[PDB]
């Protein structure tokens, strides 16, 4: 009954080039008076959200004129003739045949197009004046790969661990257009020191096959 | 300046003094 | 031109109260629906409610994750829209923005943010990454308030330089790691030093990293 | 939970606000009003100063004169006094190839770069900008050593602004005759409004330099013994030969507002048309000048009624006068609807016909007259012309001393006109400028510093005689605004002075000190060098009574002096403060263990206001 | 060459015309026959003209100062034809007549006329131009 | 007899439509394409045409 | 570009039928009401009836004084409106409009005239207003259909002419009036004569006034 | 209940010269939304209706921009800034609050604007012709007067007549700006020989006493 929106996660582009992202929904959005209810919003890395087109198709005053919505009833598109570099961020489509609605989705995360790059895939054991305090973090460093997506997992004796790691990931670089990760696994002195073998499992598109770094 | 005064207005005051030598070719 | 200037947020113990409020000015305030979106930290944009027009009876709608505990108002006279967050829970920390209309939001503030921890001012400790093209690096930890600022060799090196987002661990305080990777050359009269610096408790703290 | 209604309502107050700006965008590209951010005169008369254009013409003064013995030549005319005077080093020109350089291009070049001073614009910051250059002017005789070709191609007359200023928008010389000036401004006012450019100099510039203009006309019968243009008048005998530079700055008046820009009117509207299927090649025609002046009010959204002051092409010629007459009388004169009569004139009456920069000049009078809210002023010489039919009473000529007055919409303005004599004819509305409405160290201070610049010493000694003069006939003039403009609207040459005073006789006194080589008390020189600052802490000997006891105020020093306090306090048993500001039971500055202290507190203190 | 029976003007002018006046008046009117507008219909029209030229010497008997200044190169033209928009005679060297282009669409487009005649002309007439070059290498 | 959405979509309807007009004004002030439709030159080599 | 292009009118006898169509061009003609509105001769616009969009049900409405005699139809296929008048009456004369829109009309058709009448083909008859500044003119009674034109001397004589919009009398025959006004030389060798012409029954009559 | 709107009825105008003409209505056309339900229409003389305003202040795309509307609740104004001689003709303003119009109203007869001149008046008894058949037309002639709104009774025997007379109206004339009437009296010949005295009694502004025409 309730209606849901569906659109691409992820869209590497290229400033000069057209690009192009599809919404669909579960029913149709055309309303009696003709206008298909359908709002496209973006959010630039950090910034306000904003509107680029309502109805479908208009685009409001003030937004590029390069951005344009078309599409009816279940199958929508807004499309940038030619992106340019500030067009990065989230793109989300936001139906209002139902109201209220309760998030925006997960939009469409466009980010700079490059080639796939692998992630060089450091570990770095807990200092000395770390563990003469009482916790342990290990760090595993994935530098520099495209596109997002990069998975760790640590294994402490060829065992999975859960609930005791942290990731943070940069954002794209200005100069390479890659992407750096951080996994940080923390554990008491004690845990650490009731076990020898430490490493972590890095999975992503630019390695054939899964790439571990042990102690 | 503009730190340590604030903005004030622009007034017509004179502009650059050109130092001229004259020159007049006659051909 | 239009604006909608937010102001009203911070640090916030649970169970305390907080009030945003939104000015807008450039046009009819009184004329439009306003409605308050936020965005945990790294999540998505998530309704909290509106306020309708006059016209259309001034009412107000919430999400049910906040029903009871915030309410939204708004003063015509001063052109002001004000969020009530009562009863702040953590999982209330986030950015808030106001914006303009109730089902087509086409005017955004800059947004709020909203801190809610029952965590105490603390200095980090700094940790090296000894560099086990070669990566060595500095781990921020067990910090509060947020930020903390990182360099290397006091700004000189500068390429290959990451700085990670700040990460809040279940203790309520913040860690941040930074890393560069160097030339193999780990010795050659380069020595790397790591400059960290958090004002809200006063710390400055300089390391050295090596083998 | 929102019924459609309120859904529906959202979208078309959108698309209404959304149409709104549209229609707002489409009145920008059509008609937006361009401001005249500045304006230089050289003319006849010794008017080196739009401000002397004033004085000149509420002074009833012509300036027709016996033709000078400089230029290689019974004859009168209307000279420039420094046709021939060019700062070649100012512009990186050697003086081989200013000898080469027709004078219409040296004085061009020299009177840009005064309207860009007096649009408070420092040169260097336009260097790569997007600038446009548009000269109206005509080819004349000076070469009849090398860089005579690049001296004397018209095309050069613009590019050579470009290329010394280093301007990147479009660079025109167009010649329409007595209209050139005014088609330059016309096509800056469409290339602006295109974005063609964000900033554009137009005007115009002619000098009399071979032997042809003259006598050409003097065999053809226009030219006025006399050399008096005598324009409305029944004494009209012919023009008087003139020659000048007269340009303006332009911007969209949007940007103009949006970085704060001082603006002495607008061009509310203009048109340029031809007279066509006309009496003959030279011969005015008055329909096609309704058909002119008709445009230039649709363009500015305004009619005849609004308009209180027109300054007409007016050469004194015994025909010419009343073709311009009577199509003025069948515009301006005709729904005058109580706004009073027109008043009429001629700036001609005055410096003679300037040929391509007669236009302009035209302009840059009414400016003057909007400034003041004072009609501009017109010699008129006799009796009006038997020729002409005043009897409405709709149309006088601007005698004396005339309140300027607005129209309906509050607004003054006046047409300007120029017409040529290949029959391109342009009018311009010229209004006064909207209303522009709308942190400090070292805050209170009483005086106030005047910064001055030039590339030589004794360019800078005149700077300063001139600016004492100015400001000598102009008290009253706020001294915020003198320096202001002094350090802000200026740029910065090598050689430097600054005089600091506390009211205009003071600034006046101290800047002809500088005039002359003088060493007074509140006056410093010197010359600016790169290489940078070194900031020089001494030991043992700068401790006095309570120093710097004055900068305690100024909240940048305080908060530092501040820091020093709570520190100082908590490893000595007192404080900076107690020592600096009056001292009761305090340390005493004799004491080692204070004055060092204290010392290096008020040091780095004062190192932060730096 | 130059018809000036055809446009009504006397041998005696048209001696001293600038050839460059003369070729335009010329090439003006076959434009317009390219066109297929039959050049009276554009009598008292709205019509403008865009001449990008430089001055050259060819007079170094009367009508010499008329034969001869640039604004009359476009406004002849505009006077022979009885053309009522703009007449404008512009300099920008060997950019001239495609400046003369870019000024009638911003004219058009603004809708000071409603057709332009835009292009250039120029004749080697005067001794200068050819040794210039010659001692200047290029 | 006309419901309140009936008249609503038809004024929605005609807002964007006047929109449309006002933004094709716009594309036209700005970049209507200019037609050539003559031409003419008289250029060396014996080019009259 | 957006047209309305209306057809098929003109004379009819009371009681029969007739059927006006509205042909759309420029347009999405599916996406508007169509409506119909009428003009009687000389007096006001009176609202007929509408058509919805398919969108909104297809569904039609009527003014009283045609609702069951009147029928709206429309045909998106062709793009055409249709008015069928059945029963037709003498107060239904009128010119006929089709519009775009139900409630707001923002294009309107060149309109089509309906004359409803029982009359017969009918020539007039020419009297002479001898002139009692003079006045003198023709009356031209008692035609049908219309038009019927009227000219002095051979239109030599345009000065102080006024033909007046013919009137429909009782017996359902046209009368028109042309009057000239002269200078009182009601004789100086200036014979007057009115040219009236009536197509519709081929009678061309030239007449003298004089007292 | 139902909702009435009012306006001036004839509207003299000047060109070059603004006009502006008022509505107004029995209610508030003020919606929820924010917008006036209220729309200005113009009937040129013989051409069909079109659109100027709507929704109270919105111009319709091609109307020429010197139209404008404005007003807020009862009270509505449209504005020419400077009148052209092309603007004559009815203007109409049209509610939507309640539907359906069965009418457009009265609206407002907009011609140029000229000095009262009366209306000169002459009679024409019936010709012998039109004697030798049967019927008696007598012509009462009402020649270039303004503005609109001369009268004209018939008096036989200083007695009233009604439901005998048709009367017929030109247009503004083109270059004087004046009106002309013309009132035909129909009676069959038994009827007009039963009497002798025929007259026409004209009214109008321009004549301070009615002014009568007899045979």
Known sequence: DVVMTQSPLSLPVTPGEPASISCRSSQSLLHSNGYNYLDWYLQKPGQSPQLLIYLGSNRASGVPDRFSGSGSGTDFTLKISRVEAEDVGVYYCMQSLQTPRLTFGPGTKVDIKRTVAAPSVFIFPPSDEQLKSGTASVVCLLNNFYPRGAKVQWKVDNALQSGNSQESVTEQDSKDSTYSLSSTLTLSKADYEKHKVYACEVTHQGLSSPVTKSF | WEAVLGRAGLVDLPGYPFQGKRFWLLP | ?211 | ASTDSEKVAEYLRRATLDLRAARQRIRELESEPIAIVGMACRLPGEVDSPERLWELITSGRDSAAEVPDDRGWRAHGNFMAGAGDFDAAFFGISPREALAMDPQQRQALETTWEALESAGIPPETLRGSDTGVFVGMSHQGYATDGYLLTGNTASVASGRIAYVLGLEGPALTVDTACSSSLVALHTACGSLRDGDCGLAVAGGVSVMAGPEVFTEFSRQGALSPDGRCKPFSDEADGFGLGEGSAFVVLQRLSDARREGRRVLGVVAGSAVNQDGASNGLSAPSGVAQQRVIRRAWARAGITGADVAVVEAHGTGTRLGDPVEASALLATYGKSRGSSGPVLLGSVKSNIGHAQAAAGVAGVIKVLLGLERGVVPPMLCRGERSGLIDWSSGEIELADGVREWSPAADGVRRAGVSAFGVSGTNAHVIIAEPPEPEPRRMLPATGVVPVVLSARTGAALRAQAGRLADHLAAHPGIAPADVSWTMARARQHFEERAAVLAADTAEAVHRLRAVADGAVVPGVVTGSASDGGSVFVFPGQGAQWEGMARELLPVPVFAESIAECDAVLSEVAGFSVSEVLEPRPDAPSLERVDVVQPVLFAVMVSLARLW
């Open chain 3, 1 to 211: 031109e239009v604006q909608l200037v937010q102001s009203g947020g911070g640090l916030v113990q649970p169970g305390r109260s907080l009030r945003l409020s939104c000015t807008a000015s450039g046009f009819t305030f009184g004329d439009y629906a306003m409605s308050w979106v936020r965005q945990a930290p790294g999540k998505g944009l998530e309704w909290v409610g509106f306020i309708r027009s006059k016209a259309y009876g001034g009412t107000t709608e919430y999400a049910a994750s906040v029903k009871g505990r915030f309410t939204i108002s708004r003063d015509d006279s001063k052109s002001i829209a004000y969020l009530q967050m009562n009863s702040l829970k953590t999982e209330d920390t986030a950015v808030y923005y106001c914006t303009r209309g109730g089902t087509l939001f086409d005017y955004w503030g800059q947004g709020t943010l909203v801190t809610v921890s029952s965590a105490s001012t603390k200095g980090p400790s700094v940790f090296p990454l000894a560099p086990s093209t070669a990566a060595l690096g500095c781990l921020v930890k067990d910090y509060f308030p947020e930020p903390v600022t990182v360099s290397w060799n006091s700004g000189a090196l500068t390429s290959g330089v990451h700085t990670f987002p700040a990460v809040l661990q279940s203790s309520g305080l913040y860690s941040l790691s930074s890393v560069v990777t160097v030339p193999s050359s780990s010795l050659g009269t380069q020595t790397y030093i790591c400059n960290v610096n958090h004002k809200p408790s006063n710390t400055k703290v300089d390391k050295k990293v090596e083998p």
